[PDB]
Coordinates of C-alpha atoms in Angstrom, one line a residue:
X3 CA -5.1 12.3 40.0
X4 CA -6.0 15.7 38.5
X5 CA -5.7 16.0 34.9
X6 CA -3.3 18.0 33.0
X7 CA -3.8 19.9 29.7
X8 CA -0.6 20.2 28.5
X9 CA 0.7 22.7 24.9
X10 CA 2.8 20.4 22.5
X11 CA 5.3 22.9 20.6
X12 CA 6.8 21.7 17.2
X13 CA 10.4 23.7 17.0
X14 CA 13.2 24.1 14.8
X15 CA 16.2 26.0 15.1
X16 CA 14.8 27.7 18.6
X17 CA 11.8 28.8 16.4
X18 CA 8.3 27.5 16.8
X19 CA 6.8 26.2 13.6
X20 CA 4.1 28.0 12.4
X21 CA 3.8 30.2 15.2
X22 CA 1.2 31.7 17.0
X23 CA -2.0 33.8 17.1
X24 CA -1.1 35.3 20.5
X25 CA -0.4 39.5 19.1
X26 CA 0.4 40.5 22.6
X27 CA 3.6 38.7 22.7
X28 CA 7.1 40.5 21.4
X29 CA 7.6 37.7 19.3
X30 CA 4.6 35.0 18.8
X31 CA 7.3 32.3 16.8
X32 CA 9.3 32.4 20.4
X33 CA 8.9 29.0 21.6
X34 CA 10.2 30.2 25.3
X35 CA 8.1 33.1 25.8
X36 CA 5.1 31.6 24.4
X37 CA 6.0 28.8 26.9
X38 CA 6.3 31.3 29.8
X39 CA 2.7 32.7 28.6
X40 CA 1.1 29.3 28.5
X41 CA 2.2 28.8 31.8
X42 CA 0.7 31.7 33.0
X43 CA -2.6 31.2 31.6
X44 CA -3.2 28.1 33.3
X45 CA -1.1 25.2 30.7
X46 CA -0.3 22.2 33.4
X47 CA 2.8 21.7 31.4
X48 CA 4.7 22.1 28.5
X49 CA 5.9 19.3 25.4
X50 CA 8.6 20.4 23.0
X51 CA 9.1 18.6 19.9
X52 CA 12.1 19.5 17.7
X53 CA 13.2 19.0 14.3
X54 CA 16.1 21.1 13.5
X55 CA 18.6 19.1 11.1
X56 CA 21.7 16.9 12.3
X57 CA 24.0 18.8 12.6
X58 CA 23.4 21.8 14.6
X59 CA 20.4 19.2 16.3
X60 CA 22.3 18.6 19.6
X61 CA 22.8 22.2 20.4
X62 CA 20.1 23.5 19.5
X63 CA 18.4 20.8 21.5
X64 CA 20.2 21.9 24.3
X65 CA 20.2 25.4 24.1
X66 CA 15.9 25.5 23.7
X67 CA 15.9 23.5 27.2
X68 CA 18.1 25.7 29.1
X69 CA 16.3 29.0 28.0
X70 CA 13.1 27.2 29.1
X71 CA 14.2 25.7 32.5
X72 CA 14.8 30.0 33.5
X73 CA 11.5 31.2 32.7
X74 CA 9.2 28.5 33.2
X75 CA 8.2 26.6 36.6
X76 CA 5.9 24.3 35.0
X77 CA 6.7 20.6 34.3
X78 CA 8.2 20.2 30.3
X79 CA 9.4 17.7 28.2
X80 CA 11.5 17.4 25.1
X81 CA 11.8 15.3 22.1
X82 CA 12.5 14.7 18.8
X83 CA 15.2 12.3 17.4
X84 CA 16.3 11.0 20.8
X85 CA 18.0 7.8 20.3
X86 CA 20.3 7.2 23.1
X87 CA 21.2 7.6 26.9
X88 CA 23.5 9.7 26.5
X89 CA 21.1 12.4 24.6
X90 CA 18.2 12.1 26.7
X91 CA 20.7 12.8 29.9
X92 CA 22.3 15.8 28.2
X93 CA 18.7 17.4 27.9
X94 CA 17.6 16.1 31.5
X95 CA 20.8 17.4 33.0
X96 CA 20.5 20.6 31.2
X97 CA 17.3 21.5 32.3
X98 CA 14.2 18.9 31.3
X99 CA 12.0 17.2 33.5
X100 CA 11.0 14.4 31.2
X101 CA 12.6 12.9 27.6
X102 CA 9.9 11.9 25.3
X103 CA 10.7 8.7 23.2
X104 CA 9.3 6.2 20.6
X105 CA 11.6 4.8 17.1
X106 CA 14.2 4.1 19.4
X107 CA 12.4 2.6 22.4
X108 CA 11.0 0.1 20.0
X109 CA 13.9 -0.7 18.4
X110 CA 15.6 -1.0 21.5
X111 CA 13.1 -1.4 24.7
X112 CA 16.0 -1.4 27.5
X113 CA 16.5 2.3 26.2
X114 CA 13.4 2.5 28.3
X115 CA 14.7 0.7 31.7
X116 CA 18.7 2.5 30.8
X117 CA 17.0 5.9 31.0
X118 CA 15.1 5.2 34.3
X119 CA 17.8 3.7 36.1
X120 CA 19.8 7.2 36.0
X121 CA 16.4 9.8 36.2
X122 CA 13.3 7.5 37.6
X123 CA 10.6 6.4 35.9
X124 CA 9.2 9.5 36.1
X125 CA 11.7 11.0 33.4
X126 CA 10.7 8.8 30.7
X127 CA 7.9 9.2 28.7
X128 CA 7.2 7.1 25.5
X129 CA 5.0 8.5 22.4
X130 CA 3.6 5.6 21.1
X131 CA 2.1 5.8 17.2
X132 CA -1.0 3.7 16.8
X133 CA -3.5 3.1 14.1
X134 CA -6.1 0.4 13.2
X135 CA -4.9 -2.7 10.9
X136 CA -6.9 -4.8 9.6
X137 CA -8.7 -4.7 12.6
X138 CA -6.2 -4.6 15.2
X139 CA -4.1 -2.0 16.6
X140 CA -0.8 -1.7 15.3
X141 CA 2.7 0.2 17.2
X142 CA 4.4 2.7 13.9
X143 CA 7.4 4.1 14.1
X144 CA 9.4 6.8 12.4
X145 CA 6.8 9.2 12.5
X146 CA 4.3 6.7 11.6
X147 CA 6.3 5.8 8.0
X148 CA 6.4 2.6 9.5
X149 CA 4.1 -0.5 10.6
X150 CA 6.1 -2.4 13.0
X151 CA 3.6 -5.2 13.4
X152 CA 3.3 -5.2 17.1
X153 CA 0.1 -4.9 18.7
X154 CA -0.3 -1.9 20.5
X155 CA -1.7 -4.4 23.6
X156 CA 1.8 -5.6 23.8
X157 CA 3.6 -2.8 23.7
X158 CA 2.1 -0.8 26.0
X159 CA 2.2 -4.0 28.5
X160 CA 6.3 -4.3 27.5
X161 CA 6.6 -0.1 28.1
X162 CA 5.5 -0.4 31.7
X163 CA 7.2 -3.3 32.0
X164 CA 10.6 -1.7 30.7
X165 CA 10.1 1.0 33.5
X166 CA 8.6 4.1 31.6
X167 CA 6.8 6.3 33.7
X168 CA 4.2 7.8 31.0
X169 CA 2.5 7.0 27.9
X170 CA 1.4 9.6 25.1
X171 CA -1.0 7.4 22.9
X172 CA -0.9 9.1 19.8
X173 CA -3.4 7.9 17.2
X174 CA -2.5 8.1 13.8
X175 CA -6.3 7.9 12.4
X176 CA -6.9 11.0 14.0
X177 CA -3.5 13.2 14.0
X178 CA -3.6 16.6 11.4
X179 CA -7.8 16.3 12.3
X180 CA -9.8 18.1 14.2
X181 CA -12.6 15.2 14.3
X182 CA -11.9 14.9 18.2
X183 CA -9.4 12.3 20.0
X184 CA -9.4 8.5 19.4
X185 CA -11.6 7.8 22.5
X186 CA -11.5 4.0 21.2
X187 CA -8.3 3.7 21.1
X188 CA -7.4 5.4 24.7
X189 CA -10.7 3.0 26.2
X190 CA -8.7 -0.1 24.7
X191 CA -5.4 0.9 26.3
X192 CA -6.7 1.8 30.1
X193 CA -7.3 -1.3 31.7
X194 CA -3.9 -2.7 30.2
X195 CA -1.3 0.0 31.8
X196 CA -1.1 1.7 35.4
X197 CA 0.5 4.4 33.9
X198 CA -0.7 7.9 33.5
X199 CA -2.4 8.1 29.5
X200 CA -1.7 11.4 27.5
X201 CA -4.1 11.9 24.6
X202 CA -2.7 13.0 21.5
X203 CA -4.0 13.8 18.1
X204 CA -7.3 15.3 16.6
X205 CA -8.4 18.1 19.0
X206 CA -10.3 20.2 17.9
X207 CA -13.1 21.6 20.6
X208 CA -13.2 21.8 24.4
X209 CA -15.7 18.8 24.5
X210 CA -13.0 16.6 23.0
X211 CA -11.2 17.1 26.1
X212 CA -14.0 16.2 28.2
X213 CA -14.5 12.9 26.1
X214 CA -10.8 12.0 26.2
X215 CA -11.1 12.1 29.9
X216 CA -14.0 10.3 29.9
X217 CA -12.2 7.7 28.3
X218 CA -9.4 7.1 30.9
X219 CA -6.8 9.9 29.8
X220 CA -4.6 11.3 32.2
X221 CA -4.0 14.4 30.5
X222 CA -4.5 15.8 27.0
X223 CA -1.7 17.5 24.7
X224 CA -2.8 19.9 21.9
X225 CA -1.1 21.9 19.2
X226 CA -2.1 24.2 16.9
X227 CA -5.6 24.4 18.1
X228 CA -4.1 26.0 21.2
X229 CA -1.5 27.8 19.0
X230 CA -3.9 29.4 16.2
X231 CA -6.5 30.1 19.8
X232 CA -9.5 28.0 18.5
X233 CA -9.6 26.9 21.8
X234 CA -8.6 29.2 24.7
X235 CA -7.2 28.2 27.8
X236 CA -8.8 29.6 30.6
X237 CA -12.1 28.7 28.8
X238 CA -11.1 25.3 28.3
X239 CA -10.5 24.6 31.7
X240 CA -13.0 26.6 32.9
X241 CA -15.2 24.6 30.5
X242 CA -13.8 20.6 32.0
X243 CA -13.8 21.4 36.0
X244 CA -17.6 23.0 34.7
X245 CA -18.4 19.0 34.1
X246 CA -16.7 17.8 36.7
X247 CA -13.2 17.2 35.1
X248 CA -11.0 17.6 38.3
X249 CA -8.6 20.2 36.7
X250 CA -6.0 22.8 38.5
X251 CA -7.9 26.3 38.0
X252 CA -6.5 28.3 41.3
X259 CA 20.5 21.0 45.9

């Protein structure tokens, strides 16, 4: 019932793209440090996205989730190209909390109910691409390349259905902006889904978090405004409890 902020990391071969303004770290491109410091400075949880090529993916994959699992006792979870059972539970065993899925959940929704049956509902989360249509709002997959033409009132309906425990409702319109979050778009999913709602895409100032919340979200995930410290933490979530956003401060 509290809300999370949680820092999205975009990595490739155990580095973090693009890095990171933070000069008091040994190494600001470390995607485990900068984790650990996150965690320190008030981040709810962490979301790692990876895009190392195919075929040192796997390991790589594998060896970013161990390092993290030591140093940080904060919820995280990875993605990034998962497109089976048997790689989400190679990451979950190895030291995730949560897989994050979405091409291969729509191409294959008991991917969804497969994954929960082994690690609970609370394991899976599913990213889910949106973006107006000709009026309507339309699922996209492969990193929004392409329009699936199923409405994003089905889907979302189908995803808790399936057995997914979370939804991150990432809106297209708004993702590589900083115009603020698609506060239409989360409105229009709330009263469909029991879930917990993760805003994604568009952040760019504290008040966007308070209007995301406003909204219905659950929690809100941010990049590199967070990365590049437009935003800082503690002021952040100084900033939403402030306005009566109920947010963690202090075998």
């Amino acid at each position: 019932l509290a809300k999370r902020i949680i820092a999205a990391l975009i990595v490739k071969d155990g580095r973090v793209v693009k890095g990171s303004n933070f000069e008091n770290l040994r190494d600001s491109g470390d995607p485990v440090e900068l984790g650990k410091f996150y965690s320190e400075i008030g981040i709810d949880e962490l979301s790692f996205w990876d895009i190392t090529a195919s075929v040192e993916k796997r390991k790589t994959m594998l060896e970013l989730v161990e390092k993290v699992a030591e140093q940080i006792d904060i919820p995280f979870t990875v993605g990034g190209g998962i497109h089976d059972f048997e790689t989400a539970s190679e990451l979950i065993l190895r030291g995730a909390d949560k897989v994050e899925i979405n091409t291969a959940a729509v191409e294959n929704p008991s991917l969804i109910t497969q994954i929960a049956q082994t690690f609970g509902s609370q394991a899976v989360v599913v990213y889910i691409a949106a973006k107006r249509v000709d009026g309507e709002f339309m699922v996209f997959t492969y990193s929004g390349k392409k329009n699936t033409g199923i409405l994003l009132r089905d889907w979302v309906v189908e995803v808790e259905k399936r057995g997914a425990g979370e939804i991150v409702l990432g809106s297209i319109d708004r993702l590589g902006t900083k115009s603020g979050y698609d506060t239409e778009m989360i409105r229009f999913v709330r009263p469909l889904t029991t879930l917990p709602i993760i805003a994604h895409g568009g952040a760019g100032k504290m008040e966007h978090f308070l209007e995301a919340f406003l909204a219905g979200a659950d929690a809100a995930k941010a990049n590199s405004v967070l990365h590049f410290r437009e935003i800082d933490v503690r002021e952040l979530k100084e900033y939403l409890k402030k306005h009566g956003v109920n947010v963690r401060l202090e075998h």
